[PDB]
């Protein structure tokens, strides 16, 4: 066989220990899911410094807590825009997930509050910026560098899936790098509690699994497909399926064909063919052996999963850091004032926030 006695016993024990960890983690998540925290700070507790990113209904800013001097990232959502864009449920769900999860690669919610006009989530500040920027600048990551990040996503999805959470929003634009070079996942608007299947068309064209494109009921296997897209893009510098227009991307995704750069190792190509598998009865992460087909793949043979979780592996890349509050690794955005209206807006719909 592939393993002698000692290696087989060690692997078996490790896999049983994962089950034991996840059972405890689920119990802890379910307690917090049922008894969420709320109303833990206020706006005049913070100085607003700079915008780190924007979207159609909200922005994220670097802020400084006045009394302590500690920096945080504050997501500000305009209640009226959330309603207009049909994002009430996603917004409440994102906050509920963030309050209840606990894992070293998931961003921590430190405070949350609301006022007459806005909702506020105050999270850890992650000073290395988006993976996207580093990837486009460097061009591509070497296989060991890509593998270090991939391993963190594997563990994060193993954790989320054990809680019956599908993630659905994986891409380099949505992954931040911390001061130690490790990944932080921040965005949970598209995540959903799904023990079985779900049906919403959501995601980003390059990262959509075929079964989403084809309007099927789908399951957590879409996250394993997206992991394949991410690993490919990290290692190649471009994603496996691209074109001028989304429809042409979708035709490539559903085709069952993927091509690889000549510098990809055979181990990497094998892993990617098994993750980027159109046939759900064959996709790694969706078989009888679950996540173990991924974790035990040859491409991950050098990965010490516990050392990654414990953050004891030296990162391949440490972002520049001039000190607390340094925003050099984020883009510059037009700044806009935070207007708080004299009249409360949308109180009933956000009672749970």
């Amino acid at each position: 066989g592939h393993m002698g006695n000692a290696a087989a016993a060690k692997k078996g024990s490790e896999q049983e220990s994962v089950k034991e960890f996840l059972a405890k983690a689920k119990e802890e998540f379910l307690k917090k899911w049922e008894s969420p925290s709320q109303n833990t700070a206020q706006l005049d507790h913070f100085d607003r410094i700079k915008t780190l990113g924007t979207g159609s209904f909200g922005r994220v800013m670097l802020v400084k807590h006045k009394e302590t001097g500690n920096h945080y990232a504050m997501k500000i959502l305009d209640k009226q825009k959330v309603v207009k864009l049909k994002q009430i449920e996603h917004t409440l769900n994102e906050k509920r997930i963030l309050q209840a999860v606990n894992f070293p690669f998931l961003v921590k919610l430190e405070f949350s509050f609301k006022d007459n006009s806005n909702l506020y989530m105050v999270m850890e500040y992650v000073p290395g910026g988006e993976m996207f920027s580093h990837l486009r600048r460097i061009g591509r990551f070497s296989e060991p560098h890509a593998r270090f990040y991939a391993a963190q996503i594997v563990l994060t999805f193993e954790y989320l899936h054990s809680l019956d959470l599908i993630y659905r929003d994986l891409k380099p634009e949505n992954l931040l790098i911390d001061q130690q070079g490790y990944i932080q996942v921040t965005d949970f608007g598209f995540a959903k509690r799904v023990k079985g299947r779900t049906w919403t068309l959501c995601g980003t064209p390059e990262y959509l699994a075929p079964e989403i494109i084809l309007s099927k009921g789908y399951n957590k296997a879409v996250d394993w497909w997206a992991l394949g897209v991410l690993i490919y893009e990290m290692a190649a510098g471009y994603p496996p399926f691209f074109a001028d227009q989304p429809i042409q991307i979708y035709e490539k995704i559903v085709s069952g064909k993927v091509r690889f750069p000549s510098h990809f190792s055979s181990d990497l190509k094998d892993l990617l063919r098994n993750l980027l598998q159109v046939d759900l009865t064959k996709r790694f992460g969706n078989l009888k052996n679950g996540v173990n087909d991924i974790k035990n793949h040859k491409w991950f043979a050098t990965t010490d999963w516990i050392a990654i979780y414990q953050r004891k592996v030296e990162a391949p890349f440490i972002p520049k850091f001039k000190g607390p509050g340094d925003t050099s690794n984020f883009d510059d955005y037009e700044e806009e004032e935070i207007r708080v209206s004299i009249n409360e807006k949308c109180g009933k719909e956000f009672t749970e926030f």
């Binding site: 891409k171 634009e173 390059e206 959509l208 001028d244």
Partner: peptide, 19 residues
């Protein structure tokens, strides 16, 4: 090359989610 095709796609910047 494949890289040139990627540049030609116009989708090298941050990508939005659908709808």
């Amino acid at each position: 090359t494949t890289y040139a095709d990627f540049i030609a796609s116009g989708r090298t910047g941050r990508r939005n989610a659908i709808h």
